[PDB]
């Protein structure tokens, strides 16, 4: 008799922190999977599992077009040298050898690296940093609600196999 | 008196659930300090909200040395084709002039490349690269563990008022009875 | 006379430079008002004396934009070190108080911060430093034209009193 | 013959003209090595062609530290702004929340922001602006000589030819008496 009404209550409090448990991870799917379709602008939701991967994508295509923007100004500082030393002082960089008499030579020089440094290069990915930066900012946002996801999921079959021990103690015990 | 053995194990129950993730958070707490003390080999540990401006500083400093060991590569790929275009075909690559009779200029343009390029740079990066990937990863693997401390510290005030509150009602309740 | 023939011929020499160092200094002033003209986009080419004052807006206005975009930089820095850390710490950068119960505030910190974030700004002075480095080139390749139409306007007066000097000398010397 | 008088004229004029541009270009090259000694303290005067790397480098230099010093004051604007809204108003300016009861908060607000406003930093950049700028005036300075010194390079061995052709002519003249 006297323990039967701990076991009974054991068993509810168990059972009702199961439901509270599996409310809160639901509602951390579906924003984990708002964010994974909104992300990359998707039709239809894809599996939860999926945001580690979409996450690392993200990571990685912002870091790439970073390493790019970075790229695209230090090649265009050394062509912007080649340039004003062939205009202001007549001069090619590399040898150190004058155009006087040599307008043609000094003419490729200038057509040359003219075609090496072009602004819709930069244009495009700025634009495609822009993109990644907020992917990348929407995934972030949730990683809390999956982490918590993930820790329920180990959580809740433990505290499932607690109220299944506790509901074979209880009808065991009636007797 | 039914309900006053309900709000009394309402309140054990609490109380004992306040030591567990009291001691959790505590544990949690360790587990980050001693990382950031590992992760930067420091002498002391720091306090624990400094896991976020280390953990910020090993992701920013990795990527900067990244950048630049992929700049040093391209900067190495192109000075490449400037000596071998002079090694190779006697020609200046930018200007598309040839050095004959010019052996002095030639020799000129391979010393100006051959010290735009050197081990030094890339074995030096590498070594940071290797230790800012290091240090971030100490702090990454605690990362869990700092968020866990965080949500707790919440918890905890949340969970200690609610016994205060429990706590009144069992010292008013066995008054009145 | 030999001394008469020794005059006409130095007096003929210094008459035929001048028309050479005339004809040279037109040519660069033609060149550098070309360049004035197209450079900043003019109906009419301006007086040739204009070329420094233009020369130097040009460097100016193009380390003005220059200053700009780094500054731009490092402001953006700061504005996603603050974006950052309430999206993924949840947590004010500056007081260090985190949003607990306060997804209001939290609210109001991002939206402001995106505010900040715009990148139609970069877009423009992106185009103004591509503008101002074009017209900044084009006067740069006329410096030399400019620095010798001005020597040669030292010049000339000079070598045309001795011109003088020499005719007054030949009229003298006939007999 | 009056010809060979009228060739050695000539020749006289030309050779005269290279010997009084000679001088003049040994004139601009030991004024653009002071200037270039000068510049940069140096203990020994560095080769002509050199001014063109102390130029570029001299302008870019100070560029630099001129950007550096516009940074530093719209920085100090921000903080400023920050450190004015928790004195003035009690408020952190970022997310509009009160330091009521929350002063510790708000010293550590106010202690991170003086750690960013420190006056050393544009002492130093001044100092550097200072410094570049007189190099680079210098440089300036001496701009025309070099631009002198480069074109009667050009010219001097076309006049060296046409006093080779006009002394190889002469003697001709005399073998042809
Ligand atoms: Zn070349
Ligand atoms: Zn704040």
Same mark, same amino acid.
Request: charged content about 40%; glycine content about 0%.
């Given at each position: 008799? @006297? /323990?039967?009404?701990? &076991?009974? %209550?054991? !068993?509810?409090?168990?059972?009702?922190?199961?439901?509270?448990? *599996?409310?809160?991870?639901? =509602?951390?799917?579906?924003?984990? @999977?708002?964010?994974?379709?909104?992300?990359?602008?998707? +039709?239809?939701?894809?599996?939860? +599992?999926?945001?580690?991967?979409?996450?690392?994508?993200? /990571?990685?295509?912002?870091?790439?077009?970073? *390493?790019?923007?970075?790229?695209?100004?230090?090649?265009?500082?050394? %062509?912007?040298?080649?340039?004003?030393?062939?205009?202001?002082?007549?001069?090619?960089?590399?040898?150190?050898?004058?155009? *006087?008499?040599?307008? &043609? &030579?000094?003419?490729? !020089?200038?057509?040359?690296? &003219?075609? #090496?440094?072009?602004?819709?290069?930069?244009?495009?990915?700025?634009?495609?940093?822009?993109?990644?930066?907020?992917?990348?900012?929407? !995934?972030? =946002?949730?990683?809390?609600? %999956?982490? *918590? %996801? @993930?820790?329920?999921?180990?959580?809740?079959? @433990? !505290?499932?196999?607690?109220?299944?021990?506790?509901?074979?103690? #209880?009808?065991?015990?009636?007797?």
């Amino acid at each position: 008799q @006297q /323990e039967l009404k701990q &076991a009974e %209550y054991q !068993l509810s409090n168990a059972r009702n922190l199961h439901n509270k448990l *599996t409310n809160e991870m639901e =509602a951390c799917m579906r924003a984990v @999977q708002t964010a994974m379709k909104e992300a990359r602008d998707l +039709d239809s939701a894809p599996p939860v +599992d999926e945001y580690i991967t979409m996450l690392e994508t993200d /990571e990685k295509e912002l870091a790439e077009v970073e *390493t790019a923007l970075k790229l695209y100004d230090e090649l265009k500082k050394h %062509y912007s040298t080649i340039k004003d030393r062939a205009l202001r002082f007549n001069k090619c960089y590399i040898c150190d050898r004058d155009f *006087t008499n040599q307008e &043609a &030579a000094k003419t490729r !020089l200038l057509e040359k690296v &003219a075609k #090496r440094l072009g602004d819709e290069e930069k244009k495009e990915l700025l634009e495609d940093q822009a993109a990644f930066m907020k992917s990348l900012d929407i !995934l972030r =946002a949730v990683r809390v609600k %999956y982490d *918590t %996801y @993930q820790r329920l999921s180990s959580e809740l079959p @433990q !505290l499932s196999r607690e109220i299944d021990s506790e509901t074979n103690r #209880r009808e065991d015990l009636v007797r």
